[PDB]
Design a binder for these strands. Structure first.
Ligand SMILES: [Mg+2]
Ligand SMILES: [Mg+2]
Ligand SMILES: [Mg+2]
Ligand SMILES: [Mg+2]
Ligand SMILES: [Mg+2]
Ligand SMILES: [Mg+2]
Ligand SMILES: [Mg+2]
Ligand SMILES: [Mg+2]
Ligand SMILES: [Mg+2]
Ligand SMILES: [Mg+2]
Ligand SMILES: [Mg+2]
Ligand SMILES: [Mg+2]
Ligand SMILES: [Mg+2]
Lengths: 141, 92, 136, 131, 38
RNA sequence: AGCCAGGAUGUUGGCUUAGAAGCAGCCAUCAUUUAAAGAAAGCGUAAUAGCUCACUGGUCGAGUCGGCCUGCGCGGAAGA
């Protein structure tokens, strides 16, 4: 495994193929072309889901293309369809926005265990629960 | 919550100010059928004592001439602007 | 700008601002701005010092104004000789002795209170200090 | 830093772990990453739970005050950074090698992986363990 | 520099120094914060 | 206070789909792995990246950051 050469995690909704206003210059900053994030980008995206943001490693080399392994979609984008309210966050402590229980978030927690770091399921359970704590969703334990 | 204190002999305007200009201040102990007792005591202790909330509630044992008198701080006179005490009324 | 709503008498003697203050303890709020110095506060200074507090702590918190003017200060116009009547009432002032709590504050942190009272203190002529509500 | 009692609790906690332990392993991030944090420690989670206290405090008299009572050879290990990675389940577990294996996996250096105490040995990469 | 009568520590890197009787405020980050007197 | 060190994988997190990505504004202010890490005090970005500081480690190793109460001083302080 090599050290920091030129890898950066950056791209909007994975369904949005070839983003120029959202990202544009950043993914085409290095020697890698703009076309690479379109054909090869939607190869792995179409398996899981579209209209969903998902990250990937961009370890650029002097050859032409780059090696990559995709990870997992982040916490609250998943807590849209799962949570209910589109507006995640607003004025929680002064005015509670929403609420989620342990049973849903504990079940949602373990599905990312390929990417997630922890000891037990109950360990990352209160983490990926906690991801709700911070959207004005004081966890219904 | 135990303070050594002397008995006053001079008392009035002249004495009290002379006293307060010597790191001390006049207080008084009274209550029950016994007579009131005027009590000179040190400033810098009692200033630090009053920071705690227990001071204005709990029982204090003031040591006078050997004898330990049990009291509660009923009333108190702050100095107008400077952070310092002028006088304390100890109820028995 | 604070002012009495009707009075018995329009014009008042100059008087002598002496002795110590009476509004000494912090009664309503948790914190307060006590007047160390002696002097007088105009209606304008009070409003100016209120605005400087109110804007610092934002919408949150609660503020009292323990002082109120109720003393009309006359002033003679420019290019006018002495006598021929008492002057006309220009502004309204509260006499401030040492010890007087000016402003009181509640529902804020101690850290953010002190900085709010500094901004007010900078608008006032009198030397002031911070005081906390002590229980008895 | 809190009272002599609070400080005493920390070492007296560490000494009790040596009583119910066996193998240990050094680790000195002298240019690691937190991306590494949860590999060498994430391992310990994959073992079972929180109990595996790596207690990084080998200071000349801090964990070396507990030395006189438990394992006197670790006094010489003091100089330069060391972590006393005290284990619990499994006599001579796989937690020793993984510090040396993680060192290659994006951690710059790892104390020159000198090791601690099972046969009272020095700097030796040892795959020969119970598995 | 500024020669105001109330010099003070504006940012974090500002530092108060007394040179030849005068109180100055020297700064590493912003030379704007360089100010003397007071 | 100094010195080679660490100071996260999902957080492109929902949000007004133009972005707010630890840090415009919203508020929450996770919990894991654990020596430690706030989902962040500051710098830097169209936003990222990145660099610092909180904290935690190991070295050298002893007294030290801060607030009132005050005694004297210092600046503020330019005219024929
Ligand atoms: Mg008399
Ligand atoms: Mg009499
Ligand atoms: Mg007299
Ligand atoms: Mg009675
Ligand atoms: Mg009179
Ligand atoms: Mg009166
Ligand atoms: Mg009255
Ligand atoms: Mg004329
Ligand atoms: Mg010179
Ligand atoms: Mg001179
Ligand atoms: Mg001048
Ligand atoms: Mg000149
Ligand atoms: Mg002349």
């Amino acid at each position: 495994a090599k050290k920091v050469q030129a890898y950066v995690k950056l791209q909007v909704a994975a369904g949005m193929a070839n983003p120029s206003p959202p990202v544009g210059p950043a993914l085409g900053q290095q020697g890698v072309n703009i076309m690479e994030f379109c054909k090869a980008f939607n190869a792995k995206t179409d398996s899981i889901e579209k209209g969903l943001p998902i990250p990937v490693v961009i370890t650029v080399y002097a050859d032409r293309s780059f090696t990559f392994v995709t990870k997992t979609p982040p916490a609250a984008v998943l807590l849209k369809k799962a949570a209910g309210i589109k507006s995640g966050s607003g004025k929680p402590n002064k005015d509670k926005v929403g609420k989620i229980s342990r049973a849903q978030l504990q079940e949602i927690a373990q599905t990312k265990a390929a990417d997630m770091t922890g000891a037990d399921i109950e360990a990352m359970t209160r983490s990926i629960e906690g991801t709700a704590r911070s959207m004005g969703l004081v966890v219904e334990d | 919550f135990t303070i050594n204190a002397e008995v006053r002999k001079e008392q009035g305007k002249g004495a009290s100010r002379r006293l307060r200009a010597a790191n001390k201040f006049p207080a008084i102990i009274y209550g029950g059928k016994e007579a009131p007792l005027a009590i000179e005591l040190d400033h810098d202790k009692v200033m630090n004592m009053q920071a705690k909330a227990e001071f204005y509630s709990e029982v204090l044992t003031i040591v006078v001439d050997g004898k330990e008198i049990k009291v509660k701080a009923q009333d108190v006179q702050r100095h107008p602007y400077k952070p310092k005490l002028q006088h304390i009324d100890f109820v028995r | 700008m604070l002012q009495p709503k009707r009075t018995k008498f329009r014009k008042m003697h100059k008087g002598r601002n002496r002795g110590l203050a009476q509004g000494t303890d912090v009664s309503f709020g948790s914190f307060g701005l006590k007047a160390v110095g002696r002097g007088r506060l105009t209606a304008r200074q009070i409003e100016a010092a209120r605005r400087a507090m109110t804007r610092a702590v934002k919408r949150q918190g609660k503020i009292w104004i323990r002082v109120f003017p109720d003393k009309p200060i006359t002033e003679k116009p420019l290019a006018v000789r002495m006598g021929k009547g008492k002057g006309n009432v220009e502004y309204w002032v509260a006499l401030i002795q040492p010890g007087k709590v000016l402003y009181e504050m509640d529902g804020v942190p101690e850290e953010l209170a002190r900085e709010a009272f500094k901004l007010a203190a900078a608008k006032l002529p009198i030397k002031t200090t911070f005081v906390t509500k002590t229980v008895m | 830093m809190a009272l002599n009692l609070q400080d005493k609790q920390a070492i007296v906690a560490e000494v009790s772990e040596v009583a119910k332990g066996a193998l240990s392993a050094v680790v000195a991030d002298s240019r690691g990453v937190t991306v590494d944090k949860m590999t060498e420690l994430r391992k310990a989670g994959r073992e079972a739970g929180v109990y595996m206290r790596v207690v990084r405090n080998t200071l000349l008299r801090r964990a070396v005050e507990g030395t006189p009572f438990e394992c006197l050879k670790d006094a010489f290990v003091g100089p330069t950074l060391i972590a006393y990675s005290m284990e619990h389940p499994g006599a001579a577990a796989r937690l020793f090698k993984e510090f040396a294996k993680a060192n290659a996996k994006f951690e710059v250096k790892a104390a020159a992986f000198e090791g601690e105490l099972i046969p009272a040995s020095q700097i030796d990469r040892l795959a020969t363990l119970p598995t | 520099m500024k020669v105001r009568a109330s010099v003070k520590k504006l940012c974090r890197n500002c530092k108060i120094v007394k040179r030849d009787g005068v109180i100055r405020v020297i700064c590493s980050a912003e030379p704007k914060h360089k100010q003397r007197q007071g």
